[PDB]
Design a protein around this ligand. Sequence first.
Ligand SMILES: Nc1nc2c(ncn2[C@@H]2O[C@H](COP(=O)(O)OP(=O)(O)OP(=O)(O)O)[C@@H](O)[C@H]2O)c(=O)[nH]1
Ligand SMILES: Nc1nc2c(ncn2[C@@H]2O[C@H](COP(=O)(O)OP(=O)(O)OP(=O)(O)O)[C@@H](O)[C@H]2O)c(=O)[nH]1
Ligand SMILES: Nc1nc2c(ncn2[C@@H]2O[C@H](COP(=O)(O)OP(=O)(O)O)[C@@H](O)[C@H]2O)c(=O)[nH]1
Ligand SMILES: Nc1nc2c(ncn2[C@@H]2O[C@H](COP(=O)(O)OP(=O)(O)O)[C@@H](O)[C@H]2O)c(=O)[nH]1
Ligand SMILES: C=C(c1ccc2c(c1)c1ccccc1n2C)c1cc(C)nc2ccccc12
Ligand SMILES: C=C(c1ccc2c(c1)c1ccccc1n2C)c1cc(C)nc2ccccc12
Ligand SMILES: [Mg+2]
Ligand SMILES: [Mg+2]
Lengths: 136, 431, 427
Amino acid sequence: ADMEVIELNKATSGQSWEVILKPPSFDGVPERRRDPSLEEIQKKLEAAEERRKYQEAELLKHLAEKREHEREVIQKAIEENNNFIKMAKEKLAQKMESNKENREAHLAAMLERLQEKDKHAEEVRKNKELKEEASR
Amino acid sequence: MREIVHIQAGQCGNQIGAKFWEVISDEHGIDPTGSYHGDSDLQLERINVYYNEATGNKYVPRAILVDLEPGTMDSVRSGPFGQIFRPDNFVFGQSGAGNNWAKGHYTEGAELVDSVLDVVRKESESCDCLQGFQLTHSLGGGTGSGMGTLLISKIREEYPDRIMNTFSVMPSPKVSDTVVEPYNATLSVHQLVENTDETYCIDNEALYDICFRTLKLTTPTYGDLNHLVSATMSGVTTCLRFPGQLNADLRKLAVNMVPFPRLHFFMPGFAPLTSRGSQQYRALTVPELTQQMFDSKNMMAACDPRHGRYLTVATIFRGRMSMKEVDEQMLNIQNKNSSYFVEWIPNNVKTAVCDIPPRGLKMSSTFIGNSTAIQELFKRISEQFTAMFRRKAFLHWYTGEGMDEMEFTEAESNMNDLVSEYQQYQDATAD
Amino acid sequence: MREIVHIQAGQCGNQIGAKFWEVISDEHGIDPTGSYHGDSDLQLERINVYYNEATGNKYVPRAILVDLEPGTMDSVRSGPFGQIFRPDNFVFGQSGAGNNWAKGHYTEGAELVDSVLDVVRKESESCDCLQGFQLTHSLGGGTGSGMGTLLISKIREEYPDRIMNTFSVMPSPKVSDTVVEPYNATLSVHQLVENTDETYCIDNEALYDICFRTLKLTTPTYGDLNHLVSATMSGVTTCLRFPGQLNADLRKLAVNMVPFPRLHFFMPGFAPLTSRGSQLTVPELTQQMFDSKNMMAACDPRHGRYLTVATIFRGRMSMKEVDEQMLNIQNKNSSYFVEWIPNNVKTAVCDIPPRGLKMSSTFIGNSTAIQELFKRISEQFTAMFRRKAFLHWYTGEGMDEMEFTEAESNMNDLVSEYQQYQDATAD
Ligand SMILES: Nc1nc2c(ncn2[C@@H]2O[C@H](COP(=O)(O)OP(=O)(O)OP(=O)(O)O)[C@@H](O)[C@H]2O)c(=O)[nH]1
Ligand SMILES: Nc1nc2c(ncn2[C@@H]2O[C@H](COP(=O)(O)OP(=O)(O)OP(=O)(O)O)[C@@H](O)[C@H]2O)c(=O)[nH]1
Ligand SMILES: Nc1nc2c(ncn2[C@@H]2O[C@H](COP(=O)(O)OP(=O)(O)O)[C@@H](O)[C@H]2O)c(=O)[nH]1
Ligand SMILES: Nc1nc2c(ncn2[C@@H]2O[C@H](COP(=O)(O)OP(=O)(O)O)[C@@H](O)[C@H]2O)c(=O)[nH]1
Ligand SMILES: C=C(c1ccc2c(c1)c1ccccc1n2C)c1cc(C)nc2ccccc12
Ligand SMILES: C=C(c1ccc2c(c1)c1ccccc1n2C)c1cc(C)nc2ccccc12
Ligand SMILES: [Mg+2]
Ligand SMILES: [Mg+2]
């Protein structure tokens, strides 16, 4: 319902003052937190560094497991190949031996049949002597 | 965060990798002898990201060329830009991978992997500030797939604080080299979910359909498909290579594009879609370029963006155009197609504008999207995988290398878990 | 598999054996002095199978001539090719076998057998790769029959891994030298069943009827009969002697011709049938395989079923025509081939025809019809054995009646086995 110009300061480069249109509707004035120390700051920064270091370490640990699996695959492929070679070697050895035994047995039985005939021929000729010169 | 170490593995890896180097060398004014002959200082501001500076003001790709088969790297050496590569950076074996992930990951590949790491170490140790690694490979074969993922995990162990970025090409029966592709891709996806920070899903099914349906090519070749790949790879790397507004590195891309660690498979998109013989077009305005971000026909992954929701999008506009028009048009697409963006990631679309257009084009737009619709690509691979795995068809080729049936079961469930996670966020509402 | 050691035993054995050597020497271009004078390199490619190469580019039959009677080998020595044989290879006794199997097998023959084995050993030890033995003998007599079978069993003991092949001539009353031929033949068949790998049945009943009925010879001699034997023996051995086409040997013949070990008695067949002075189409030659009139064993092929057949065509002829014609006979006469031995007929073609013929065909058949030959000998044997007629001729040499009983039942068992496979169907 009026105005009030209140001179503040006048210096070489300018002037300043306060203009009050209306005073406050409340006279009795209005109706920071320490610190943080260097130690507190260092603690927060170092805790974050250790979390980052943990994350990276755990990611390298995962990759290390992969290298282990890769070596395990290669080794499995070696093992499977070696088992194939050994089973083929043994099965072949068995076939070649079973076959030698069978072939030997066939020939053995054949010669025994012929040997029986030779024993019978001796008996035939012996039987002839029991008849011939024995009677007249 | 300046240098990127590029690695190309296997047949596909080296084909798309060589095409990337031919295209970006042309943009940067580098000829096949490594000499600069351009007329813009923007072309050399960030050359250091992909090229090493050699004596006699020449530039050499920071590229490592890997394969278990010697043949492919002879084809590279004889190519247009074949002479530009460091000869010591060619790491080739003599017995291939026989399109078997197990051979690439555990047998032939495991024997060559240390020779590759020696070359990566030499490149990486020379870097002022290593950003990370960019790998090109296919997931359908043996070397790119098996050996590429073995390289990833070995690089992850040696450089855990560096970004691992891949351009992984997905198999399709429409362009198939081998019957065992679904096994190879599943075993790889499992590795990518765990060991990469960001992957660009280059789907051969999507590339085939672009050529056939859009470009009307009755019988498209690998050359036709690779034209789309090189255009995408150039677009997607624009902000790593050229100065402007955001700077941009592989970590910044990862941070802003990946809200959940496992969900790091990007669905790239490009406009305009051209063929090699397409020497016109007399086409595409700013509103037209912006509209192609929801167009399934422009996606490099065989997924419909309209079947999911975008978690995040990064968009590159290339050429002389109104940056004000781009901003207006991009906001319009978000306001009109609001239901295809996740509401719980505020302002999830970022736009970049580069004055330099790619070769043969006066204006282009590339979209890098982290969409829940990418689950369609993983569901497709899983269906193919189970059709075969149910019958244990071709399994002896893997178990013969020492693998267990268990690894197949684990990779399959990890890919199905990836699918369920994309679904979880597609249904998730802001509450 | 190269060298064959040929043995000829007894009157019949040495007669047919000499005729074999005369015929094959002519085919191979070998003259009675052992010199080659032919105009084909095919004649000498496989000469090594039957001939030893002697100094002065000469060829000597790998032949052993055996007999208990000295007379026959004097007749051989004086014959056309008599001088071609190694003189030390003639092993002869002085007291014959008196057409008694017991004398040949146990008495006179047993005393000469070691002298023969010494000569077989010398021939066999010199061989690079011994195929085996080829024996010519009759089953009706005593030397060829008794001593021949004793030789077989003794060679079987010393060379068990070698093939034993025989050309055994069956007796007939139509051409008979002795009344005891059924006993001699039965005692021999028993030995052949057990100790040979393959036997060619040369039946005198069949040879007599060919001469009499077909050749219209009122009174045929052994010369007339032996003309048919030499033609057959030449035909049947063609693939052992000549290049191609196939590289036949005696074991290969045994393996492919004999499905059951005891059933190794072949019924030979030949076309055309000619007399000892005569100087036909592919379909005509092929048709003679079912013709009973062309069989060297007195059996009708149409009364049994063929287990296996090996056929030789000789002369300049279309090999395509032979193949077509042979398939035709199998399709038209399917009921005379056992269905449970797939593709059981094999054909060979030789450019060289036999002497006096421009085209010939020989059939080696393993037919169940051969039981007719064994049934015939068994009926004759039983007629005699039932009455114990002439038995003292045998028991006098030390033999037992038991050996007769055993040989008889072994031959009847052979007959039942042929019947078993004749009635056997593919199920
Ligand atoms: N007014 C104004 N804002 C800027 C400027 N540069 C960046 N910003 C804003 O600052 C925010 C990004 O912070 P920056 O200052 O660029 O980043 P930084 O703190 O250097 O570090 P990094 O995030 O590690 O790149 C965005 O909202 C920018 O719009 C500038 O020169 N002027
Ligand atoms: N395609 C073809 N088949 C052949 C040839 N030679 C033989 N045969 C076939 O192979 C089978 C017989 O095998 P062979 O090679 O003659 O016998 P092998 O291995 O020499 O054995 P043995 O002579 O019994 O020691 C038959 O089906 C013949 O038709 C040839 O050169 N080409
Ligand atoms: N887009 C594209 N795909 C390719 C190319 N070459 C091969 N492929 C794909 O790669 C997969 C087979 O992998 P590949 O790279 O040839 O085998 P690797 O050499 O064993 O890694 C299949 O899905 C093919 O479709 C190429 O140049 N471009
Ligand atoms: N085909 C033929 N049969 C003969 C010949 N000589 C004898 N035979 C038969 O042989 C049997 C008698 O045997 P033989 O060889 O003469 O007596 P061995 O000298 O004691 O062996 C009888 O069945 C005769 O028919 C011959 O040269 N040719
Ligand atoms: C750094 C980024 C980038 C990516 C996605 C982003 C943000 C930043 C971002 C900022 C504010 C709000 C949302 C945001 N989204 C979703 C980037 C942007 C583009 C256009 N292209 C790139 C090509 C290569 C490397 C990086 C980029
Ligand atoms: C080696 C044989 C021979 C025998 C009978 C055969 C086979 C082979 C055979 C092959 C396939 C199918 C069926 C077969 N049969 C029944 C042979 C054939 C001939 C015509 N003549 C010969 C003369 C002397 C030595 C051997 C022969
Ligand atoms: Mg900054
Ligand atoms: Mg052979």
